[PDB]
Scaffold this active site. Structure first.
Site, PDB file in Angstrom:
ATOM      1  N   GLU A 109      -5.119   7.882   8.968  1.00  0.00           N
ATOM      2  CA  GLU A 109      -5.301   8.764   7.785  1.00  0.00           C
ATOM      3  C   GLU A 109      -3.726   9.173   7.489  1.00  0.00           C
ATOM      4  O   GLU A 109      -3.171   9.921   8.135  1.00  0.00           O
ATOM      5  CB  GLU A 109      -6.260   9.913   7.889  1.00  0.00           C
ATOM      6  N   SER A 110      -3.272   8.788   6.178  1.00  0.00           N
ATOM      7  CA  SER A 110      -1.880   8.702   6.037  1.00  0.00           C
ATOM      8  C   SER A 110      -1.602  10.130   5.971  1.00  0.00           C
ATOM      9  O   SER A 110      -0.402  10.298   6.529  1.00  0.00           O
ATOM     10  CB  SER A 110      -1.891   8.290   4.581  1.00  0.00           C
ATOM     11  N   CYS A 143       0.765  -1.156  -0.015  1.00  0.00           N
ATOM     12  CA  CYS A 143       0.026  -0.102  -0.148  1.00  0.00           C
ATOM     13  C   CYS A 143       0.788   1.251   0.123  1.00  0.00           C
ATOM     14  O   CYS A 143       1.652   1.473   0.857  1.00  0.00           O
ATOM     15  CB  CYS A 143      -0.780   0.013   1.158  1.00  0.00           C
ATOM     16  N   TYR A 180      -5.063   4.744  -9.598  1.00  0.00           N
ATOM     17  CA  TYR A 180      -6.074   3.943  -9.233  1.00  0.00           C
ATOM     18  C   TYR A 180      -7.352   4.473 -10.025  1.00  0.00           C
ATOM     19  O   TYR A 180      -8.259   3.266 -10.789  1.00  0.00           O
ATOM     20  CB  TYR A 180      -6.594   3.848  -7.932  1.00  0.00           C
TER      21      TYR A 180
END
Lengths: 312, 303
Positions: B127-128, B43, B174
């Site tokens: 939350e990145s 990821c 994506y």
């Protein structure tokens, strides 16, 4: 898709079984070719297309010998679906004149109503005997190379007796590990099969690149049927194979010597008009849902080839 | 699949955005050994926080669990599977069980990375974009190696490049990949390549995107580039041309990927497996190409 008893079946090979009923999958029409020999302006008709790299082979030989008005053509649609290769309206299609078939399978059947086998291009059709003369690429190539020489063909011997052994050596490896290699890879269903195909494929490129080092052509220094069967695979490689068929260890673009051979040939007037990458790209991405279900065609690699610029 | 009530499923309205925006206030806190990080080698979102954790030298104050490369009918999993380490906190099998331990009535996407407070036995932040800001500072009093990747003086530039890079690159691969109609496909990455162009021009002369600081705009961006030529180019049809074809982007990728601390967070082999193995809708054969042999050319940058 197969022809089973003159009937078109996109349903197995089939219910029973191997058998049950065994179906011959090879090219079943191996005419022309014999002792002596060969033919005639206006007599034979080529069925082919822009997607198939096997059909490409015969298009390149038909140009290189200048038989384009001695041997007429029909050209199939890029989308191969329920009915397989079709002549339905669409980019680059050129209809089945004499026979007016909607589907390629109807060409096989027009000749032999119960035909059981695969329904492929290229087909060299004998207009007089109203039938298939020969429908194996490797063979047609030779039929077209030898004697129309007699009757107005451009001179050119792409299977020089002096060299047949070496040409043969190369055609074999190239066929087995590259021509049919990219398919064994792209259509493989297990990772092991994919690797066991993909790796010999690159071993063969790695080899071809060396062979080509101080050379201009594969055999002696003459364009020959060796290059003519290698080129169709190369020309589709980066723009189709490398992605769709996962042949992506590196690009043909990364092999200077090969990239050079491809440029040479894609630049030849005569060969150039036999290329249509838009069409191939579309047939491959859009006709293989096992491999590419959305059918979506990548925005491609932009500019998949070169030109010709390293003389003196 | 979603955690519906949950109740893991493959009528309620689930919320797309990540739901635990903890940390972030005046105070921090940032005690050593208190926080646990749930990430993975595949990821990119996760990769952001893996990098920021490695840069701030916090890999011992913050324990990891690292999900398995195969996203199945269960979701991210900790199954003994190949490339990594299990859940030393709840010995969970599925990532979804982590979410569930804290809120047995949770409704949301089950995603990574996750910042878990071992003490309150709950999720701080998942939350990145936020997790990286926390790590970049709240530990400085307690042992973090000096670093400021959101230096106040630049927050505007950083923040603006981030916005573009996010919505058309970070997220664009994506969108182009799971796009289901030629038309949608082309709507997504033509403009993604536009941004690569912009980024290339913009990176001409610079060594980093902003300041002459390696900054969070660069960390937010590296994960997409480093996976790009290996996976996105192939699997998501993002193939207009390689990152190899952009010289300054390549310069930046090399420069970061050779950074010690950073290099250890890159497992392209794992990445490839996960993408090619886990999106049957995009690649149903599940085969993982081979492919390309040297993704990012090595390392050599100087005068």
């Amino acid at each position: 898709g197969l022809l089973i008893d003159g009937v078109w079946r996109d349903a197995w090979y089939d219910t029973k079984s191997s058998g049950g009923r065994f179906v011959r999958k090879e090219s079943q029409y191996r005419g022309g070719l014999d002792a002596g020999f060969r033919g005639e302006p206006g007599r034979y008709h080529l069925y082919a297309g822009f997607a198939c790299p096997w059909a490409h082979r015969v298009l390149i030989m038909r140009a290189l010998k200048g038989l384009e008005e001695m041997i007429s053509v029909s050209m199939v649609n890029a989308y191969m679906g329920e009915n397989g290769w079709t002549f339905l309206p669409g980019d680059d299609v050129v209809p089945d004149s004499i026979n007016g078939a909607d589907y390629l399978y109807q060409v096989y059947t027009a000749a032999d109503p119960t035909y059981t086998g695969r329904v492929t291009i290229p087909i060299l059709w004998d207009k007089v005997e109203k039938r298939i003369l020969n429908n194996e690429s490797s063979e047609i190539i030779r039929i077209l190379n030898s004697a129309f020489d007699d009757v107005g063909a451009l001179p050119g011997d792409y299977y020089p007796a002096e060299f047949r052994p070496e040409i043969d050596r190369i055609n074999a490896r190239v066929y087995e590990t590259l021509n049919n290699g990219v398919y064994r890879s792209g259509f493989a269903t297990t990772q092991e099969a994919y690797e066991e195909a993909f790796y010999p494929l690159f071993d063969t490129l790695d080899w071809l690149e060396e062979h080509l080092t101080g050379r201009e052509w594969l055999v002696g220094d003459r364009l020959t049927e060796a290059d003519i069967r290698l080129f169709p695979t190369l020309v589709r490689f980066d723009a189709i194979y490398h992605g769709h068929f996962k042949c992506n260890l590196r690009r043909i673009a990364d092999y200077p010597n090969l990239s050079r051979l491809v440029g040479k040939l894609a630049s030849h007037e005569r060969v150039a008009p036999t290329i249509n990458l838009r069409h191939a790209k579309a047939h491959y991405y859009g006709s293989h849902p096992s491999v590419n279900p959305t059918g979506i065609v990548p925005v491609g690699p932009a500019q998949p080839l070169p030109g010709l610029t390293l003389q003196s």
